[PDB]
């Protein structure tokens, strides 16, 4: 056998519980995530795989579910997104726009990923957009897998070469943003398997 | 559009194919062995080295409490019930005074370890449980049968 892992160095802030989100305060979600793409305090979080609108109920679902299940002794939670501000006329509710690849909630403390996998997956299913629970190790593996597939691609023709070279006049039928996406993002959805 | 869909299909990632699947691979080398378990080596080495003759008898479904009572019972016989997990027992011969006693220590069996040739005390231990079978006694660390153990013991 080998020594068991320890979380002694980890420090739990006093405000273990999640704070309340207000009910009330154009391509906000049609693009790649530019903010909250890096783990800040905790080793686990939720990663947005699509562009969705988070209303107050979703925040309560995240806040209420996380607070009830989380252990203040060994866990802490922080908010990685602002409160809803975009009105939905019937105004019925307000929402928080999210971009593909945005970290919405980050949890840390003296806990393992498997402990939080079930709750995070349940929250992700309840989210308005496709999402996947992520951790520091898992997120890097995704990038490492992403790099490996890109590096070993055997296709003689690639999206970037055709797009940048304007072969067939493809740029006439492509949007300016498509050049940045490089086929990995379509509309408000992000294609993880597109390498 | 259909035309844009055509571009995506051509750009689809192509994965390379390995020559041989991992299961059907040719025999590859393996890492060198490591002794983790090392503690248990010292305990068994001491007891066997201390006790020249070991009586090997299969262990019936005995209780842990009885073994301590039997351990005290052997103390009257000047013998010790020192036992440890047997999955580390087999590598004992690999790193110990002898390497050839593996066949004697087959399965889960009670080991009576005595350093002195007190035949009567050893025989009395046999009398304690008749149903329990005595495989034999390696008198002077020499492989022998139960009947042979008595014959040499005489």
């Amino acid at each position: 056998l080998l020594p068991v892992p320890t979380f002694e160095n980890v420090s739990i802030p006093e405000r273990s519980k999640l704070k309340f989100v207000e009910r009330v305060p154009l391509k906000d979600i049609r693009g790649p995530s530019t903010e909250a793409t890096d783990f800040t305090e905790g080793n686990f979080a939720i990663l947005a795989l699509g562009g969705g609108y988070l209303h107050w109920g979703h925040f309560e679902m995240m806040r209420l579910t996380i607070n009830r299940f989380m252990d203040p002794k060994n866990m802490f939670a922080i908010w990685r997104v602002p409160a809803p501000f975009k009105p939905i006329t019937r105004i019925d509710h307000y929402v928080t726009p999210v971009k593909t690849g945005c970290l919405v909630v980050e949890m840390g403390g003296r806990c393992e990923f498997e402990e939080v996998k079930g709750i995070l997956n349940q929250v992700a299913h309840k989210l308005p957009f496709p999402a996947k629970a992520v951790s520091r190790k898992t997120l890097e593996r995704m990038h490492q897998n992403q790099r490996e597939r890109e590096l070993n691609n055997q296709n003689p023709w690639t999206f970037e070469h055709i797009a940048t070279a304007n072969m067939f006049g493809i740029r006439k039928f492509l949007s300016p943003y498509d050049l940045t996406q490089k086929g990995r993002y379509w509309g408000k959805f992000y294609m993880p398997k597109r390498v | 559009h259909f035309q844009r869909q055509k571009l995506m299909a051509i750009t689809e990632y192509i994965p390379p194919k390995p020559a041989i699947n991992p299961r059907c691979l040719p025999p590859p080398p393996k890492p060198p062995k490591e002794e983790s378990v090392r503690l248990l080596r010292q305990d068994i080495v001491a007891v066997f080295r201390d006790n020249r003759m070991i009586a090997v008898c299969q262990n019936v479904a005995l209780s842990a409490e009885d073994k301590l009572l039997l351990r005290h019972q052997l103390r009257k016989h000047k013998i010790f019930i020192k036992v440890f997990p047997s999955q580390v027992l087999k590598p004992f011969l690999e790193n110990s005074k002898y390497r050839n006693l593996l066949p004697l220590f087959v399965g889960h069996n009670l080991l009576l370890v005595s350093e002195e040739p007190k035949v009567k005390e050893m025989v009395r231990v046999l009398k304690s449980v008749p149903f329990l079978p005595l495989l034999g006694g390696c008198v002077d660390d020499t492989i022998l049968s139960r009947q042979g153990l008595v014959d040499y013991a005489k």
Partner: peptide
């Protein structure tokens, strides 16, 4: 509407021809 096998091959061949045009414009 899934793309026919023939359609994918035809575009690839045309793409290669345009690549040859690039090289002869490189000197």
């Amino acid at each position: 509407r899934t793309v026919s096998f023939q359609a994918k091959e035809s575009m690839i061949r045309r793409l290669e021809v345009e690549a040859e045009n690039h090289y002869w414009l490189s000197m």
